[PDB]
Amino acid sequence: AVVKCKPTSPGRRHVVKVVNPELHKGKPFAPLLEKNSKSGGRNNNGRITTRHIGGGHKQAYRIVDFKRNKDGIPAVVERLEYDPNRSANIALVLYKDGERRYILAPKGLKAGDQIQSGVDAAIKPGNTLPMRNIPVGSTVHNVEMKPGKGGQLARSAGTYVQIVARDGAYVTLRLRSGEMRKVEADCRATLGEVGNAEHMLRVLGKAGAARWRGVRPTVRGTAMNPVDHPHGGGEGRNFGKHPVTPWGVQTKGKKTRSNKRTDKFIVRRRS
Amino acid sequence: MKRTFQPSVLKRNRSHGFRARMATKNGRQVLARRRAKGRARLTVSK
RNA sequence: AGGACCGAACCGACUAAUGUUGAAAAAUUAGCGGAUGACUUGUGGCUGGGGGUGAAAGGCCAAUCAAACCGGGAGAUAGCU
RNA sequence: GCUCGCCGGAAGACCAAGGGUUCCUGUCCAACGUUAAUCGGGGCAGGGUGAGUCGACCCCUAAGGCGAGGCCGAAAGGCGUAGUCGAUGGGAAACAGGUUAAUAUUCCUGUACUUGGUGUUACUGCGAAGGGGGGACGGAGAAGGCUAUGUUGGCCGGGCGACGGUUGUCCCGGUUUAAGCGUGUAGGCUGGUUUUCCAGGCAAAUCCGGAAAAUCAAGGCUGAGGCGUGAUGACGAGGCACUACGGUGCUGAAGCAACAAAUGCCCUGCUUCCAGGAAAAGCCUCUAAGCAUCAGGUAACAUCAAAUCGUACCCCAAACCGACACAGGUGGUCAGGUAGAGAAUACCAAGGCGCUUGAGAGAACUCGGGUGAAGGAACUAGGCAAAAUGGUGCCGUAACUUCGGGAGAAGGCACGCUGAUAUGUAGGUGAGGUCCCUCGCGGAUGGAGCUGAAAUCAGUCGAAGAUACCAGCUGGCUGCAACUGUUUAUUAAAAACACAGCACUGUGCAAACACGAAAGUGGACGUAUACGGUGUGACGCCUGCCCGGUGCCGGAAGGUUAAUU
RNA sequence: AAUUCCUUGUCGGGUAAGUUCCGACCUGCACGAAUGGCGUAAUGAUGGCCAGGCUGUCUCCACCCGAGACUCAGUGAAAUU
């Protein structure tokens, strides 16, 4: 639920929270936890490769099942849980054989709802089947790009894809980016949309709220002494050059896709 | 005022110790130079 | 409840005087700011020089920084003293 | 040695880090000590550091480091798997008293505890480089129940006052005692028990998990403190004999209660919030391969062993970092009394110091302070500096506003002491007694005693009662930036940098991008409600015209156009 | 105007007197709409201006308490030349 806090102090005027009471008010499932040490945006050489990363709250990794290869075994949802490693919420499901796993939470999934994976599964949200058996024009998420390796598309809070056609061993999809991509008709996909749609309506309200997320401040470049950045300096606010990244690339329209390896699945890249 | 030398025996030996010098080609050359010069104390070990 | 309020510890350093062969190669005294947080702090660890790090001042990288220190090329060159 | 003065949330006490004999005794005074020096952290010599329980080593791992093979790379070498190292973290056990010139939870006395080895006896399904459990974890807040500790009274001992009074409601002092063992309370968590079955836990499994029935509600786990024992003991103000006035043997009375009360304990709890909160081993269990009159396992008794290194001393400082016996810097622990909201502040206790040149004089001038006639910013770049305001409670409080604020706005009144209401009130605490009872650290009733505000009325002293230290100046107009924050260590703290928010743009995952000759790593164990880059910079009303130029994104008829041929 | 050279622009307000300040005028030397424009409560050791209170800031300094300066004893530097 979206709720606007009251302006009891500067730092709470514009903060807008997303409150969901359905979430579990307790500890998560330990057997599916793992250590996740922070990096600070640094690699094995100790150099900063990705800027604006550092600090934040400690986080434990939840082992999520993106493959959904437990075919022919129904599972009931026990509870919804908060996951700090992603934008969407997860669900703890219990199978008939006694195995527990974590999955992404679709739009209208609750506690007690039954799910199932495989080709003999029903067409309902939460179930997972190969796109060959998915009716065209349907909405799915957690889509596999290659059979057996796990979902990689439509995993964010309120993301989803739409199946538009099915020519042969392949099928065509329109991604949330507007791109029209095609993949094999053996990649599994989960019905429905990931349910945290109101996650986008969140307003942090203050700088510290971003530091909690592990985001370090961004210094622009215009006021950065050209020895450090092309935009550099000047007496006052000059900026008399074309916008450009550090290391000298436009960043205001220049395309930088140079794969050329796939070049087969893209049809309507976007816009 | 806080000065530059804040001693610590552990960091001293891990940074300039014998086994640290003997773990790299360039560190072993440091010992070779100090041996050829005749240094009585090669390292900060003790 | 709060990057909320007053205010010690703690972290800082706005003003003034003193000191300027100082008690001190940046401090003292009287006031001053923050003080549950983007806070502070101990131990250990990683990033190495046209490179690092930088809430960005060309700031900091062992009292040294518009390119550290040590050694070497090296008795650089000096139409100048 | 008698006084005086200073610190007392330290200028006291115990440690880590670091130093490394500075510790104690004797002796010496050249040099060292900013003076003298009989003294010293100085010179010389001797002496001093005693551990199964403290710590290290050791077992286990974090960040991270090394890295058999291996991948990569002109060479050097780089990354990294299996593994192996790596605390700042997890993992068994000792307390009190006494003692040395110098050490002690290490020696002595007394009383305890832990982990292993061997052996004996009795009962037995034992076994992992595997499975599961557990270890195992956030912030804030709220009380309640306790203790450390303190105050008072009582008890014991002593005292009757250098100057009026002081045999009493008077004065001084003491009134201390552990771990461990036993009891399992306040209180917290969880429904137990038996049977049957199963696509799960890399194979198995009596264990974990799951499903379906039956049967009972009382079952268990955790748990401060208290009580008892430990303790016919030890300690104990003061005495009795020695007493080189340096101390040693003996003896040694009381040794209770009430109240108050922590930032410490119950609490790794309870409640609540979003930013959603280490790992591994020890430990408890499960079986497999295997071994079964063995071996091994559980329990009891007995016995042996628990090594090695550190232990002195300083440690907010004269012993560490600062060239100095340098107004500096340096992490943790202990936290008394009166007043007080308080770890502020003032004065004190325990304890520790008077800061390693002094003696005189009482000029200018300088430094640090006090007071000031009349005037009151006329000073000056500028109210710089100084002066001033300062507390609690009640009344009262504007424009504007994002309706939270502004606001402690402004401003005004009252504050001491004594007595009474009330021989100390409301309240808090709660004994004995009575009654119940699953008779227990129980419950109810009960109200002694102890403690103790605030307010009112009356009276009273002083120039002044928030009397000292402590402790907001206030208001009006306006520029800039929204705000909290950040910054030129060492002349600039700002209107600069960040900021939430907004927009453009790139990016379909072996993502863009970045560090890398490469492998590979980060991005991310993320997947367009995501990530990177750029500019703008809360919010509110808005963001207009121009694509010729430069760049970016597209396009194709043609022209020009490299290697090559 | 943090932007206006001419310039102390002109009028008005405030002062006995106002190159600053506030409010208007527009002849914008040389504002202008995300290198954002105009507003904006709250906030600020931020810039400017005006009041009350306060005062040795000043008219105009005086006295006093202490540490130095001065004298005695001991120790015993420095820049410069």
From Swiss-Prot, chain A:
Listed PROSITE patterns: RIBOSOMAL_L2
Keyword Ribosomal protein: yes
SUPFAM superfamilies for the chain: Nucleic acid-binding proteins, Translation proteins SH3-like domain
InterPro entries documented for this protein: NA-bd_OB-fold (IPR012340), Rib_uL2_dom2 (IPR014722), Ribosomal_uL2 (IPR002171), Ribosomal_uL2_bac/org-type (IPR005880), Ribosomal_uL2_C (IPR022669), Ribosomal_uL2_CS (IPR022671), Ribosomal_uL2_dom3 (IPR014726), Ribosomal_uL2_RNA-bd_dom (IPR022666)
Ranges of biased composition (kind: Low complexity): 38-47
GO molecular function: RNA binding; rRNA binding; structural constituent of ribosome; transferase activity; zinc ion binding
Family label: Belongs to the universal ribosomal protein uL2 family.
Annotated protein name in UniProt: Large ribosomal subunit protein uL2
Organism the protein comes from: Escherichia coli (strain K12)
Underlying gene: rplB
Curated annotation (Swiss-Prot), chain B:
Domain of life from the UniProt record: Bacteria
Cellular component GO terms, alphabetical: ribonucleoprotein complex; ribosome
Keywords: Ribonucleoprotein, Ribosomal protein
Protein name per Swiss-Prot or TrEMBL: Large ribosomal subunit protein bL34
GO terms assigned for molecular function: structural constituent of ribosome
Organism phylogeny: Bacteria, Pseudomonadati, Pseudomonadota, Gammaproteobacteria, Enterobacterales
GO biological process, one term: translation
Pfam family, one: Ribosomal_L34
NCBIfam families for the chain: rpmH_bact
Homology family: Belongs to the bacterial ribosomal protein bL34 family.
Signal peptide region: none
